[PDB]
Amino acid sequence: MNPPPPETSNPNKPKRQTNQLQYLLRVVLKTLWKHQFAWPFQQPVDAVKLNLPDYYKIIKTPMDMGTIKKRLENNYYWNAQECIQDFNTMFTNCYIYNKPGDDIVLMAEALEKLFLQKINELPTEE
Amino acid sequence: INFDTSLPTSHTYLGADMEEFHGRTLHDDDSCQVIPVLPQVMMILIPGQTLPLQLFHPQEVSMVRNLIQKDRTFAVLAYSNVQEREAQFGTTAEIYAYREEQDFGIEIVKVKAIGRQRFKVLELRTQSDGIQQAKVQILPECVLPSTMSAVQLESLNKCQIFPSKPVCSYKWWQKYQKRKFHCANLTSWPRWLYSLYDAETLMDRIKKQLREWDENLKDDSLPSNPIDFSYRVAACLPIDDVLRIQLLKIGSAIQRLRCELDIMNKCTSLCCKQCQETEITTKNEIFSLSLCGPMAAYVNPHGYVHETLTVYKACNLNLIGRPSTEHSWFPGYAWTVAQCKICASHIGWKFTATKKDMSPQKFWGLTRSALLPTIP
Amino acid sequence: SYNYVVTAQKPTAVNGCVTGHFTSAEDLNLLIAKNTRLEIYVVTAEGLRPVKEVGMYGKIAVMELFRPKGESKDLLFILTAKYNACILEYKQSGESIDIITRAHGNVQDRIGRPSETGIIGIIDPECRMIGLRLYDGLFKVIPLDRDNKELKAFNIRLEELHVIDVKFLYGCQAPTICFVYQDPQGRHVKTYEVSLREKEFNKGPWKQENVEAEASMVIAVPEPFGGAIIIGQESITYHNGDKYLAIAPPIIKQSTIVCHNRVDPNGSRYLLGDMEGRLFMLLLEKEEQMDGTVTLKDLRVELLGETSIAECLTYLDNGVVFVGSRLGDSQLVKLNVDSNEQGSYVVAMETFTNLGPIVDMCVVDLERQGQGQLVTCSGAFKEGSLRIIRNGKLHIRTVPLYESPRKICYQEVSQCFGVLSSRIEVQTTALRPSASTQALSSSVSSSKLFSSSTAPHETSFGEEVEVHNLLIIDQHTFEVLHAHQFLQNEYALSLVSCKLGKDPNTYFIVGTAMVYPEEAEPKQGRIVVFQYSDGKLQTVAEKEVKGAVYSMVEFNGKLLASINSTVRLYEWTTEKELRTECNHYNNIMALYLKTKGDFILVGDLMRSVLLLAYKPMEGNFEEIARDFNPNWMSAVEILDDDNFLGAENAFNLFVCQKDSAATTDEERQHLQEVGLFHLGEFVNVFCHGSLVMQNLSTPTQGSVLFGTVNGMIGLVTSLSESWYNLLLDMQNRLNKVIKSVGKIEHSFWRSFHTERKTEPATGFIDGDLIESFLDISRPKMQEVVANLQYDDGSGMKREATADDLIKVVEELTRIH
């Protein structure tokens, strides 16, 4: 079954605004969102309707760019590093769960190349 | 509307701008030629068929880029004896459309190629780095003169040509048979026996089953040659892998024509290859949305060639994602993935209409290497 | 394997005939072409007087007479089916008659698709060129001066690819043609002009029209009228400049005019002949218009009478007309000024025998002596008959049938013959009294297994239906004793006479296919068993079969029958039934079945030879070998346990082989071709037997006979290797001495030819060329035999002498 989704709006987590979080929202997230291979990575895997009951025995930390989007709009992250690690988590889940040469693995790989190209120009903290 | 069927034959998902080629090379019959083999291609190619390609590897890119200089023909081994990269026959493919891309540091080449000639493999050497050559002998084509040319009466030569075929039909063919095979009383065999080995009468009998699938079929959309007709009919029959090498081993169109007539009155229900017992479609739902027949070879965003069969209806499936209109094989439709509802195997897709009044409003497309043509 | 091929009866069908002043300027001649034989006569008041007879290394396709300016008599132009041309002149020195050749050469394009209407060859009325239509979209022109002694020609392109008929025209300053062609619009008549210097067609003297849809024949009227006559199927039209005259004779609507001849030198009258043996006269009415002008004014046709089915025609003199035929007998008729009581103007004078087309035969002995007799199934439609050839110069006898005989077999116990025949009936009503109808007893099959559920029920008006029959013919009086009529829409393809199991009775067994006009393949069939006793016929049992019975053989007390692809083998039980024993499913239809011992030979019409064997203890069939090569094949025969003989497309013969001591199992399942030969004719049936006295045979191992479409009968016998080498040397030595007419090479004639390849003959020795060793003079024999060795030791009889070889060839000739 699908688990409950990751929480949104946790008052106990500290936050601030930085140019890097703004860049990660206004440029990076929209850029990935606008991709032909983006569509599978936009919401939690819904294992009931997709009939994948073994997914969440293996995957205990679901994550997606929709969730990340809500976190950014709701100012959930403390720093750029946290988000870079979350994106890498998304990629790693795809390579762990699926097999080399599978369509979804090529799609994730395509997304990650551009992600790396983009992160190479993360601005210095103001 | 109508969905101009010349659209899928052009492969516009690959692009629009491509360099094109015109010059031709055909080798003599029963000569030995050494032709490079394109690796990782696992499919049976028939003369006259179209195969689209998307290459990424440096060995597959540097080869195709030196084909372009010399004669543009490589070799497609059937590979489908069983497996294990050992084949006895294959088809030469000639390149006519060529596009060279660039990506994140990677060279990509896009190619369209057409099947040219059949041959038999003699020697297969893996040379330099990953490119297998092939000694090969060109298999001849046999053109058989009509049966009554030998016993034709000299005074009956003038009355051989008939008036033009009318655009009812039951009378014309009887008149066709009575006059063409009149000189059958000079032999031991009756008139109707020579009609069973007649190239025209065998092409006309096959036609009376192809137009029943989809009913916009026209004569000029279909070859009048015995050879091109037989090859084009062989490339759209939903038959097993075994029978394809059987049709490619025949050197005469007439035996190929007669063989195809027997493969057409047997295959009814197509089932899931992995489960072998679950029904997907039948032969009643086949129809042709393309000028090449109900079955053609398409290519993937990642280079995975699929030979797809279009049908009106399909059962025993369930839907995975949401419709995706990008890189669609049939312009004007969006595909959602279909999988066997009982073993979750990849069966094919489902195409839905974009404009809210189109030729059909939905249809399914099934890959060849996922269905078992069984017997009901 | 080695073999020996020789012909017993020369071909008898006629494929061309011309008249003119060939032998001398004064005497009228009649020239006949019988496949490869040419005959020259002299027409007299009494009849025909033969003067000369020659053989040509080829099938004569075009034969015409012409006289260039400055020559005393006509010259003859010939073109064979391998595109070999010549010009021949008659020369008479002393009492010797020889035909001199004056110009020859091969006229064939390296690449090209041969036309669909055959070879056409015409000559200009002023003798300036020759026009040939061999390949589509081209026209060949030969200058006709004295220098062109190699027949050098050139091609002129055409924009019309469906030329039906073409003729030169009379009374034009420059050579003019006129041809009918077909385009998607229809049939039109055009005209051109041939320039020798430009080598290209100019514009035609008159303008193109829209001729009838079925126009096929072009006639070039002589000088006084000019122009051309177009004959189609419903009308006859005359074209010249602006003048156009057309008539619609209602009496020629029944059949199709296919041949013509000119009676009067000025074109006043013409003879016409249709398919069904009718003779017509076409008259041209002249007018003078006070201006010194002669113009046609009207056309009419008359029904002269009835003759044989005519392939050619020729008016000789005083109402004597020669009717050359292919399906029957050639005739000499006389035209009467006044009609007889029946209304015919035709009174038959002579008749010439013609055994073709032989569709079946059998060898029997009707006197229990040594010499055997051959009984064939000749002719077609109203010309059908039985021919009883006896060795006696062959002594042929004719038994008219007025039907189409198909199959023949002999029952020694009942002293009768079994014949499968067919008569054409119009929807039924018979057309003429057939041999089946004029029979003592009759029996019509009763349909219980056939409810005729599958039928079109489209019985039209006046459509033609075939009715088949089984005829019992006595072997002494040859009269018809019985007639059995098969069911409606029923064919009859096979027939066998044998006894099965442990019965002492001898039966007739027949296999049929229930064809229908709609389905392209039969789905029902029948096997029926007949016993003719004490002048009565009966049906003991019948077994319905799902398919068409193409063949039947008796297999050691069992019935081996082919049903489409199945090779089902049957049994005869005590309760008089047929019970299945074995099967063998195939990828081909078994049309030809031959049996020897336990092996079974299976073939289809596309030359897919197969070899099976019977396994007694297991009771099943197993394949031994196979050879597949797409081509057209006529018939097959079994020579030995290992060799198999057949006749393939383009008038060829081939023999396979089986290797029993092969090293591996790959070559133990393949048949190796060991013989190829261009016989020159269309073989249609093979039989074991002989006509000479039985025995009392060093170059002889089996004596297989065959019969052809042109009515030629030949013999093939196996041979020893030493003698095969000897005969190969004989042929090579004789070809240098023999001067062929037309200077054709013998190797080219006998080369295995087809539309694809052309390999020299191997494994076959031609006896016709060797038999000529005796006609030549003694110095010629000495030259042929000089420097040759033939004996068993003792220096090979030193220099082999001519006398040894002439004795050898006489012994060879003794076999027929």
Ligand SMILES: Cc1sc2c(c1C)C(c1ccc(Cl)cc1)=N[C@@H](CC(=O)NCCCCCCCCC(=O)N[C@@H](C)C(=O)N[C@H]1CC(=O)NC1=O)c1nnc(C)n1-2
């Ligand atoms: C809602 C969520 S969440 C989520 C998924 C979904 C739908 C997916 C999912 C899988 C694939 C893709 Cl692609 C997108 C999303 N799968 C689940 C797990 C799961 O069920 N796996 C078994 C998959 C079996 C069928 C594979 C068929 C591939 C061939 C093809 O269809 N290939 C295309 C490219 C093609 O060839 N297209 C043609 C058609 C045309 O017109 N032109 C073309 O090129 C999953 N795992 N992680 C995530 C996240 N998910």
Ligand SMILES: [Zn+2]
């Ligand atoms: Zn399944």
